């Protein structure tokens, strides 16, 4: 959908981080679905042999179950589904700013307009200092930027919904690293388990070993630092929002930069694309403030005149 | 798709080697979560740490089905070692850094953009008359040419200024480098602890009965045998790495010499581009020199009279 | 087929967590064709040993089997198809309103002349307010338009197939609702078998634990909350969208901000599917509105005159 | 493709209900590969025909490969073939259906005929001559003449034969007598899906004992499986009914343009014959605003006034 | 795509035929490799080669679990039948056959090259406005008429030499209808063997402790049932093949008549074509008529001649 | 995409059997993966060296972990290597004959010079000027004035160069080579894969037993994929023995049009030498027509007629 040109550097490391916890998610879950199980033995009273416990094989198997809904804790059996939910709430978040319809419609003209003014012949030519066909697409191209402009600066959706967004994200990282620093010691490969089942078996107190224990954790580990990493992007996000006002865009290095002097200050919801863009690259933003001036629109309208008469 | 230019032989070769690297760790996780086991006996007669060894009929050991499971748990997850439990993720770590090292110039927008610009302009360069006409016209071919000669212009004062590509490009070839050392150097120091006879001393004789197990590891040939074809497979990165890196560092990839196009052709006058631009016309020398010597005639000031002259006379 | 400008926000949303029970519902049945079992024990009668059951493995298996049909409750087992069926038939009332053929022609007849409706530069010179050879172009688009109108304006053929089909979402939301609300606690880990198979294993009361008990437990909790969320939403819709009749969407705002105030009063399924795209993007309502306008249509006719003169 | 308008209400319900079918068979036969077998435990107590009712554990000194045996021999002998073959009688009942119901969009006489049909229906829908008339320029007009003639050689080509008409009532009466022998086998044969089967297959020579009770494990799955099918085979078969009275209700061979004549201005539109009525009908049921356009085309006096537009605009 | 006129209902019924059978195939194979086993229990009493037959009490025969698969691997590879165990392999042969017997003339070049010429010239005739006014203009239009007339000539001149592709259709047509032949020979002979109990002699005695054993086969039902359907389909395979055979030696396919259309139309002057056009005019006329109706108008000099009066009339 | 122009016959039936050898070396590592083992019983009769052959089942007293351990230990030690990484090897063997096969079109100067010459044949298959040469618009004229400029201009860059060849030459001495030692190697270790395997892994302080016999149940399955494989390795290695006696029986680097210029209206078409010579005829192997109609291109009296012909239609 070409929507890369609205996400920066950070989005792209987000998108890419929340892809691979999403495949670290998927698959601790597979494990847990193929290979999850606890083995346990009782605990016998006080050439070597055997210790016979006289116990059949499914006495072992419901053992087995009996101990890993009781004695093993939640943390260590519902961890990759509470890791799935999270990377989808992630990227529900990251999705969220361009897949609600009001928004959407918003930076899809802003995204046609873009790549209309970045392919428009009319810009290079004012960039320099024609043709009557390129003069009349260059006035409707006029006339859509400035519809846009009147339509777009009145609202402040766009700048509160990402605002919204990544204020989301930066509380669900401190509230997941928060609760998962408690519980990443708290796994463990051995267990004790008293499931008060002496009247079908006959023993009271089981050890038990959990299989995936020590992957787990590893995968614990491994999603913790990855985890970690997305939260100092999302901070560094959250840093630039706060360091420059988004509200309003000044155009004075374009002004001063380009020969039209005649550029107004766009603010709002445009000033905030326009920002993204300038994050992304600064060709774009060129393109829309040597658009914006009114002497380009008199020089049109001169061209324009010498083409008729 | 349009990015093949930028992507000379080292560049495919390395593509592809990490593309079977991939393929071989993902076989190797599966193998390790779906077949990877450890079946382990006790050993009655103990002399040492380790296990000793000395009509026929079996010997009973007394212990369960589930005893036997807990022995084989307990045992492949104490006293195994740990390259031969994670010898797949870890080699689907490096290969994922490796891809990353590769396609991050290609993801970063900084880099994207430029890269992505001087493709667009060198495609558009190779297709256009004037090049073939200027090498060996309407009015719309020749305000096509005057735009494309600005355009080119443009690029060159917008591009030649910096050289993030350059340099991002040497930092991912030295990541690379130092990351195929690594390897090379704890892969193969490694490489013994993949063995199939392990003798554990886990101590579960309170529930079993028994101190010392001999397992074996049905997996250990076959992990040993991806070890070897992964550590030739990155012995083969590694060379061609080192072979990018002495091509970098041979000569100055930050001045380009029209040399041999100006003496080839008739246009004596084409500036030297440096910084990132000098390191792309590197990158497609590499590739193909026709797009080269193609794309120098937008440089020469000659050809930009020559284009004038004729827009001056389609003109009138 | 470009159908998202038909769909609001609230139909977007009430179809991604219909994706979301689709999915839980997948999952559920994968995991009870996957491990979904119980383990079953006698309850024998009055230095700690094993109790040795004298049952063979066989037995065992027939004994956890028997009590996986008749100790086991039928919404423990048959959950997944149920949420599954309720899945399909919620997408369904979703999307008949297209698959039916006596509909979607007259939706993609809609969609189609939508198209022109919005994106022809009349539409931009009447909101303001170009060839007359323009004009002349959509003379005829007027007159196709006008023919659609005086075609749909006496149909209530979609409007009546929408409603229905949100009342059996409605509908459908509360069944569920209630009927899981309902069989909550009575699904237990534990269970009481008595399957009368004495003459088979000698023991007549079992105790059986079902493996995948709380799994299905919290996912009847996740599907309780998804369904509670878009019963919510489908009840706001019912309250807001649907509770003032769209069978008319005479022009009023439109006319207000519009010169041209004599607009036509498109009713019935046409005015139906107005409604839809201004729930969907005002500013198609806008350029809709300036430039269906008969006097919009007279003053296109007499500009095409002028410059024809 | 361009064959969706083409089918029907009741063509595409049938085609839902197929796939839903075709959806139903691979999950029976996945849970007949995957989890379908038999649990048996003999009866020591045979004093009655079947296994006879009659603490501490009864020990019958099988070994599990004897159990396995007994299983496996239980499995083939004494159960019901339907309760084994329910799924892949499934999935050879879609088989048929789906055959059946693309059967004229594969068989290339009718393919050939019905690409063609769409094609100029195509043609004559977007052509610029009907919104004109039912409400220019030479290319046009020159293009609506060549439009006019290949309708011509279309309709002199297609209402000789009766290909089209005749496969599709053929499919439509394979289609109904298939659904009455599902109708007739899977009732009759849905009682014997039952949980616990008595077998008594007189392996004593290799176990010890003679009858034994087994439990069909997926028989209340397959059983619920067997009633949602029968009753898609009930609507299916309603739909193939319903299909079968519209085509026999009424000549579909012989096509009335007196409604679209009324309604226009050209009162000479003949009525057309044999598979070209039958694919006006067949469009009728799925838009009437595609005949009421391809109309124009079929009256010689929409020709004649073609002609007269063409010297109009020529001088 | 384009190649569907190319293909007659017998070609399309046999493809659907192939499909079948490769997914029965495919079902067969999967059920061989997951569930394909032999539950065997060894006989106390034995009379003959075969096993003999002779409250109640079960048979104890002092067998481990190991000893009860090695009888049931040794008796699965030796007593019993090669078609039980290879029917799906057979089968997915069978149809890999059949498929390339049926996609040969279309991935070999030197008749792929053939068919792609006249698919794409007999397209372009048939939606050739030359032909809509001849079987009842501008300049632009009467050119490329005439350019697809020298084209259609070159092509007719081309191909009407050879023979390659009717030669190698007729060859197909006759490998298929003798290996339908011979898989209706043995299977039908050989499918006697696929039964549910088998009775081995493995001599394992010194192993296991007893001579003979009987196995049942849970998967010898359900292979009958697919050899059965198998047969089935390889019959109907057969039958619509022998049609084809009888078909193409019914009338010569190297010798196209047009006399029914000019019979119908004016044109009466419609050369004989033979070779490879006459076979693909066949194949058409098994298609559609039509097409073959409209490509006669590039045929008869008729049409060349009013052709060449209208760019004449049109040129001054 | 284009370059199926490129491929000869040869070269579509080697793909075609890596195809079906990547499919069989998929099947038998999923075989290795899933359902590969060893079922071994000890023999308490060791009087020979192997297995000695000497009612009541045979009590081993061994616990089933024991067993499991016996066949790991069996299945590692005494088991051949061959057996054991089959379907490895032939994945590897496919691997590589996939990537010679398909080296010149990764190779990014041979890739860049086929796909130019690709485009340039099909710019001239579809140039109006070969038609009207081989039996008109001012545009036409200047696009096939370009067009032969541009041939020009690949004729000098690629004649030159010979690198083509070279690497196409190389590629089949390669397969060939690895076809040779693939041929030597399977048929030399085919016999290795058997049913009953005897072996002595001395693990008698952990189970009693000196010498076992095993039985592996898919080696007979793993023999009939081999000679499935030996007979594809044969039919690969006679097609690339064919392909290399065709390069080396005519030097490949010369191509003349003498045939094509006395059939054509040129007769002054040179010959070509190098790269360009050898995908001439490559092409000829794909079809003579297309190399018929690029010879137009290459020659001085086409230009001079085309020249003549702008004149013309000039004034
Ligand atoms: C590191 C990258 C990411 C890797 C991610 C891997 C995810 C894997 C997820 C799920 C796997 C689920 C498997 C099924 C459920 C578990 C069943 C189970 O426990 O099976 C155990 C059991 C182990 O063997 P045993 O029967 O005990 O006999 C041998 C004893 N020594 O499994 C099996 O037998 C069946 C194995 C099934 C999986 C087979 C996978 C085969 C994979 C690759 C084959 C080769 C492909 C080659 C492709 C080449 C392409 C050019
Ligand atoms: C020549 C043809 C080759 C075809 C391909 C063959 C190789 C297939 C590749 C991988 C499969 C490997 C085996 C399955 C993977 C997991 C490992 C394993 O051992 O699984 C065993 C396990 C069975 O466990 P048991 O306890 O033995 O079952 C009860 C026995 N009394 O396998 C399974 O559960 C899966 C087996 C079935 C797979 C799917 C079969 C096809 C599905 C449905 C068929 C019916 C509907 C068909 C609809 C067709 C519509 C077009
Ligand atoms: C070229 C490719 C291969 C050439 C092989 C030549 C072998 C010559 C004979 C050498 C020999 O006798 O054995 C070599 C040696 C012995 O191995 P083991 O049996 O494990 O060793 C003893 C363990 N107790 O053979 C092998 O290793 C077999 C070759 C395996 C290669 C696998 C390559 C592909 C691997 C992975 C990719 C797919 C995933």
Same mark, same amino acid.
């Given at each position: 959908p070409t929507y890369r040109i609205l996400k920066p550097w950070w989005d792209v490391f987000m998108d890419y981080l929340a892809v691979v916890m999403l495949m670290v998610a998927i698959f601790a879950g597979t494990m847990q679905l193929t290979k999850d199980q606890v083995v346990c033995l009782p605990v016998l009273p006080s050439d070597p042999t055997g210790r016979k416990t006289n116990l059949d094989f499914q006495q072992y198997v419901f053992i087995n179950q009996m101990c890993y809904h009781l004695?093993?804790?939640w943390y260590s059996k519902y961890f990759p589904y509470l890791a799935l939910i999270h990377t989808i709430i992630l990227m529900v978040s990251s999705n969220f700013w361009f897949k609600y319809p009001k928004t959407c419609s918003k930076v899809e003209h802003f995204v046609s307009i873009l790549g209309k003014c970045f392919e428009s012949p009319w810009t290079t030519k004012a960039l320099s200092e024609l043709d009557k066909k390129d003069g009349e697409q260059a006035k409707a191209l006029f006339e859509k930027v400035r519809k846009f402009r009147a339509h777009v600066e009145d609202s402040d959706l766009i700048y509160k919904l990402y605002v919204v967004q990544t204020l989301i994200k930066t509380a669900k990282f401190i509230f997941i690293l928060c609760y998962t620093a408690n519980f990443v010691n708290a796994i463990s490969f051995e267990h004790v388990c008293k499931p008060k089942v002496e009247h079908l078996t006959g023993y009271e107190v089981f050890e038990c070993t959990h299989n995936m224990a020590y992957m787990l954790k590893k995968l614990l580990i491994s999603y913790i630092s990855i985890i970690c990493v997305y939260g100092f992007i999302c901070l560094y996000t959250l840093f630039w929002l706060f360091r420059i006002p988004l509200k309003e865009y000044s155009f004075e290095k374009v002004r001063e930069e380009s020969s039209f002097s005649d550029i107004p200050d766009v603010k709002n919801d445009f000033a905030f694309l326009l920002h993204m863009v300038d994050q992304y690259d600064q060709l774009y933003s060129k393109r829309f403030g040597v658009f914006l001036s009114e002497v380009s629109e008199n020089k049109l309208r001169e061209i324009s005149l010498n083409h008729e008469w | 798709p349009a990015y093949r230019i930028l992507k000379p032989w080292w560049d495919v070769f390395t593509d592809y080697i990490s593309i079977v690297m991939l393929m071989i760790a993902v076989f190797g996780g599966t193998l390790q979560v779906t077949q990877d086991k450890m079946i382990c006996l006790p050993c009655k007669?103990?002399?040492?740490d380790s296990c000793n060894d000395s009509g026929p009929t079996g010997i009973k050991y007394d212990l369960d089905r589930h005893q036997y499971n807990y022995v084989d748990a307990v045992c492949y997850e104490n006293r195994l070692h740990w390259f031969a439990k994670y010898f797949p993720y870890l080699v689907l770590l490096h290969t994922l850094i490796f891809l990353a090292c590769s396609n991050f110039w290609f993801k970063f927008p900084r880099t994207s953009s430029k890269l992505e610009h001087f493709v667009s302009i060198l495609l558009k360069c190779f297709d256009s008359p004037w090049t073939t006409r200027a090498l060996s016209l309407d009015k719309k071919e020749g305000e096509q040419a005057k735009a494309l000669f600005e355009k080119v212009k443009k690029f060159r004062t917008h591009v030649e200024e910096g050289d993030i590509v350059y340099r991002l490009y040497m930092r991912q070839t030295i990541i690379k480098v130092i990351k195929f050392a690594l390897i090379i150097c704890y892969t193969v120091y490694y %490489?013994?602890?993949?063995?199939?006879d392990v003798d554990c001393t886990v101590d579960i004789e309170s529930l079993t009965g028994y101190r010392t197990y001999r397992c074996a590891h049905p997996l250990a040939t076959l992990f040993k045998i991806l070890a070897s074809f992964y550590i030739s497979l990155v012995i083969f990165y590694g060379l061609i790495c080192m072979y990018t890196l002495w091509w970098m560092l041979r000569?100055?990839?930050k001045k380009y010499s029209f040399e041999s196009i100006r003496e080839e052709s008739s246009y004596s006058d084409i500036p030297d581009v440096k910084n990132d631009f000098a390191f792309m016309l590197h990158l497609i020398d590499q590739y193909d020199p026709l797009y080269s010597k193609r794309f120098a %005639?937008?440089?020469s000031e000659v050809s930009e009279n020559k284009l004038r002259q004729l827009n001056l006379n389609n003109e009138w």
């Open positions: 004695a093993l804790p | 007669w103990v002399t040492k %490489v013994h602890n993949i063995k199939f000569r100055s990839l %005639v937008f440089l």
